[PDB]
Amino acid sequence: SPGIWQLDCTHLEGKVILVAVHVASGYIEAEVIPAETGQETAYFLLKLAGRWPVKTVHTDNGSNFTSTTVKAACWWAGIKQEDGIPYNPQSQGVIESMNKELKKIIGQVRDQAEHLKTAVQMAVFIHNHKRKGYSAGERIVDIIATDIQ
Amino acid sequence: SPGIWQLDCTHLEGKVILVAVHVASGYIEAEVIPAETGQETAYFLLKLAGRWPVKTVHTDNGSNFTSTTVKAACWWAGIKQEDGIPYNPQSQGVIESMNKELKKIIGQVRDQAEHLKTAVQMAVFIHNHKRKGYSAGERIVDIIATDIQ
Ligand SMILES: CC(C)C[C@H](CNC(=O)c1ccc(N)cc1)Cc1ccc2c(c1C(=O)O)OCO2
Ligand SMILES: CC(C)C[C@H](CNC(=O)c1ccc(N)cc1)Cc1ccc2c(c1C(=O)O)OCO2
Ligand SMILES: [Cl-]
Ligand SMILES: [Cl-]
Numbered sequence: 001s002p003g004i005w006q007l008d009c010t011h012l013e014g015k016v017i018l019v020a021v022h023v024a025s026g027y028i029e030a031e032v033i034p035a036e037t038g039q040e041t042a043y044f045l046l047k048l049a050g051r052w053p054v055k056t057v058h059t060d061n062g063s064n065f066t067s068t069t070v071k072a073a074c075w076w077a078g079i080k081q082e083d084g085i086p087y088n089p090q091s092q093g094v095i096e097s098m099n100k101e102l103k104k105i106i107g108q109v110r111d112q113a114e115h116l117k118t119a120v121q122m123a124v125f126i127h128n129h130k131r132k133g134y135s136a137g138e139r140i141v142d143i144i145a146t147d148i149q
Numbered sequence: 150s151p152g153i154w155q156l157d158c159t160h161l162e163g164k165v166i167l168v169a170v171h172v173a174s175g176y177i178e179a180e181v182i183p184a185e186t187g188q189e190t191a192y193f194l195l196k197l198a199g200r201w202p203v204k205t206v207h208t209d210n211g212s213n214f215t216s217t218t219v220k221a222a223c224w225w226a227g228i229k230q231e232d233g234i235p236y237n238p239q240s241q242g243v244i245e246s247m248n249k250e251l252k253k254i255i256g257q258v259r260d261q262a263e264h265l266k267t268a269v270q271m272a273v274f275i276h277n278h279k280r281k282g283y284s285a286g287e288r289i290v291d292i293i294a295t296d297i298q
Contacts, residue, residue: 029200043267050274051178051200053286076261077274112225118192125199125226137202138297145294148287 002147003055005048006084007064009036010099012106013116020048020057021098025139030102030124032117036060038067045070049077053144058084102127151296152204154197155233156213158185159248161255162265169197169206170247174288175281179251179273181266185209187216194219198226202293207233251276 001024008019018040019030029048033040041064048054057079059065065083074081086092105123106116113119128137150173157168167189168179178197182189190213197203206228208214214232223230235241254272255265262268277286 043270046267046270046274050270050277051286076271118195121192121195121199122225125195128199134297137200141290141293141297144290148291 002143003053004058005052005054005056006058006095007041007060008095008099009060010102012103015116017102017120018044019098019102020044021095022052022136022140023058024143025136026098027128027136027140028098028102028124030120032120036064038064038069041067042069042073045073045079046077049079052140054079056080056082058082060084151292152202153207154201154203154205155207155244156190156209157244157248158209159251161252164265166251166269167193168247168251169193170244171201171285171289172207173292174285175247176277176285176289177247177251177273179269181269185213187213187218190216191218191222194222194228195226198228201289203228205229205231207231209233 004023006021006023008021010017010019016033016036017030018033018036019028021028029051031044045054045057054077057074059070059081061084064070065081071081073079102123105126106119109119109122109126113122129135134142153172155170155172157170159166159168165182165185166179167182167185168177170177178200180193182193194203194206203226206223208219208230210233213219214230220230222228251272254275255268258268258271258275262271278284283291
């Protein structure tokens with residue numbers, strides 16, 4: 001549970017937003033990329049895994065599941081690469097809802113940033129700090145700390 | 150001290166490596182940039198603060214302390230922007246040692262990556278996972294979790 005992440009790819013302004021969600025907490029990391037490639041996904045995973053203890057990643061689609069560069073990054077970082085098939089059907093809708101929520105935040109900050117990448121990081125900030133009462137940022141830290149102890 | 154970070158800028162292969170160190174744990178985040186500008190530093194801080202609870206940042210030099218874009222990012226993210234003057238003289242050497250250690254790791258992985266940015270993220274991974282016995286990654290999580298409770 002504490003090491004499980006899900007990849008998610010959404011689109012805005014003719015650009016691609018790559019998202020990793022910590023399943024147990026709802027905490028996210030995200031980046032804007034020109035297009036979703038194996039190489040971009042692999043690089044994003046290397047960054048993620050140096051920052052949080054990533055044990056398992058549910059990939060967002062079959063191309064990233066298949067990508068040799070993604071497989072190389074998962075091997076390098078000690079990550080079990082799995083599919084992201086929603087065997088639990090509620091999973092699709094939950095990801096859908098997050099994407100809409102993220103796009104909504106982006107719209108609310110879009111004025112304060114010249115570049116989309118900046119607005120996305122602002123949206124990450126707002127999402128992770130939002131009290132729902134703990135925040136996603138508080139939850140991920142508590143979950144991982146409990147796992148260590 | 151759970152919210153205190155220090156910025157650090159080092160050079161390699163004609164490029165700039167921008168580093169943020171969580172002072173209490175030794176945990177780091179880093180990025181390769183073309184050159185250290187206010188705008189790059191501001192963007193890096195927005196990313197950092199969406200991921201960890203950044204309360205205070207000791208800036209790496211006077212230009213980033215002065216930068217209006219850096220000041221804007223600190224205001225936006227709720228960060229107290231401070232100087233990084235080593236009133237404790239041991240601070241200079243500790244940062245020095247980390248930079249040398251980081252460059253050494255980069256050299257050990259440099260073969261496994263075509264691009265410096267990739268080697269830097271690999272070095273971040275190795276640094277944060279290294280058992281010294283807990284790792285920096287374990288320490289930052291424990292420090293922050295304890296602060297929340
Ligand atoms: C902290 C934030 C409130 C302001 C920063 C500076 N932006 C402006 O002054 C500005 C300019 C024109 C506008 N129509 C709106 C805002 C944002 C920022 C920081 C670092 C970056 C950026 C950006 C960005 O604007 O995308 O781009 C990559 O490096
Ligand atoms: C996971 C790692 C073991 C291998 C990845 C693929 N690299 C190679 O196959 C390769 C090619 C030529 C060499 N002389 C050495 C390694 C690294 C990687 C992943 C994502 C990226 C990258 C890189 C990068 O190589 O910098 O660049 C930006 O997006
Ligand atoms: Cl870690
Ligand atoms: Cl946070």
